[PDB]
Structure 1
Amino acid sequence: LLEDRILTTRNGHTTSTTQSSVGVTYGYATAEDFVSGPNTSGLETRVAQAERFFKTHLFDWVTSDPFGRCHLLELPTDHKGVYGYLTDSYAYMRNGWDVEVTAVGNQFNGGCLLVAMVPELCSIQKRELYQLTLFPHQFINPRTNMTAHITVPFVGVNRYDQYKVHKPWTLVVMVVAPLTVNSEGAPQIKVYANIAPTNVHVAGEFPSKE
């Protein structure tokens, strides 16, 4: 019912589609820092096999749900498949979370969540929450989009980041505008999150569980 806009994004074998598209946005970068560094002394390889989508749940955007609820989700994070085993068999590596965020209600509600993908951190000041508009981020509103999407690069502090004890990437969605069921609108919107780790290479290796 418009200028018309659709889109499917393939990562390995996994492919998220959508219709309330709106587009996307890459921030900070669009590339990747020469991952043929000195510290990895040629001892690094491409494993674009675990490069794809996995599901994890954000909060539940509810009418009450105040002007701040911004369910965080660190990236990296628990992986019951590939990328996870990789982090358990490896010390040094680096990637780039794709991230294609959905939040289903319908084209009748009010309010907006604020999607953003920010690096190194610890915790944020509420007074600062008024500037996610500074790091890779999207804006959701059921009257145009149902999907978000924003594809993040690699920042790390180093070329080949270690994750056993460090997580450079964090994902927040503060409720910028509270939700309104309304007359005929939907009842509730569970914000679902679809992620994927891209252009990633490893270096390093430990013994085994034995």
Structure 2
Amino acid sequence: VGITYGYADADSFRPVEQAERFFKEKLFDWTSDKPFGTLYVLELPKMRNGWDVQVSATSTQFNGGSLLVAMVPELCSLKDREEFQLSLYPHQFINPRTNTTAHIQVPYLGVNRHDQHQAWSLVVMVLTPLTTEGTVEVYANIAPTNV
């Protein structure tokens, strides 16, 4: 639980940016009928800017499951066995019993210093099917930083 800064600079954290705009959107209905690997990919944007996404879910003490929320840079496609290595990307876990809310911030990334071109894609995967003992909804809050 906390705030994840993907591809962070080691020197910059030795002992600035901020979110300018805001947005909200529902992604999918988290239900037990979706097994592992139920990907939901959202390209960003839906100016040399870094993104800041706060994916949240509505879960109670009787809800169980796990979502993997990551930001893949230039996700053209995902192969059959590639999902298992998604943790290679700036990612977080949403668990109803641990944090039930994700927050990832990534810098500008590209071949050039100015972008047009979906550089980043927010990917949400259902790592484990939803378990209960009454529906769970996922809402994504996306805000550009340092435009």
TM-score (normalizing by structure 1): 0.63
1:197 matched to 2:139? The reply is no
Given candidates 140, 155, 163, the residue that maps to 2:94 is 140
Percent identical across equivalent pairs? 69
1:58 matched to 2:5? The reply is no
Task: Report the CA distance between 1:109 and its aligned residue.
Answer: 1.6
Partner of 1:188: 135
Task: Report the CA distance between 1:143 and its aligned residue.
Answer: 0.5
Partner of 1:102: 56
Task: Report the CA distance between 1:192 and its aligned residue.
Answer: 0.5
- Map residues 100-179 of structure 1 onto 2, 5 A cutoff: 100-162=54-116, 166-179=117-130
Higher relative contact order (CA 8 A, sep 6+): 2
TM-score (normalizing by structure 2): 0.88
For 2:61 and 2:79, how far apart are their aligned partners in 1?
A: 32
RMSD of the alignment, in Å?
1.9
Encode CA deviations 1:145-190: one digit per residue, 9 max, x unaligned.
Answer: 121111111112211000xxx11110111110000122xxxx2211
For 2:62 and 2:105, how far apart are their aligned partners in 1?
A: 27
1:29 matched to 2:28? The reply is no
Gaps of at least 5 residues in structure 2 are: 11-16
Instruction: Tell me which amino acid in the other structure corresponds to 2:27.
Output: L
How many matched pairs?
Answer: 141
Instruction: Tell me which amino acid in the other structure corresponds to 1:144.
Output: T
Gaps of at least 5 residues in structure 1 are: 1-21, 32-47, 78-92, 201-210
Structure index of larger Rg: 1
CA contact under 8 A between 1:120 and 1:156: conserved in structure 2? no
More strand by proportion, 1 or 2?
Answer: 2
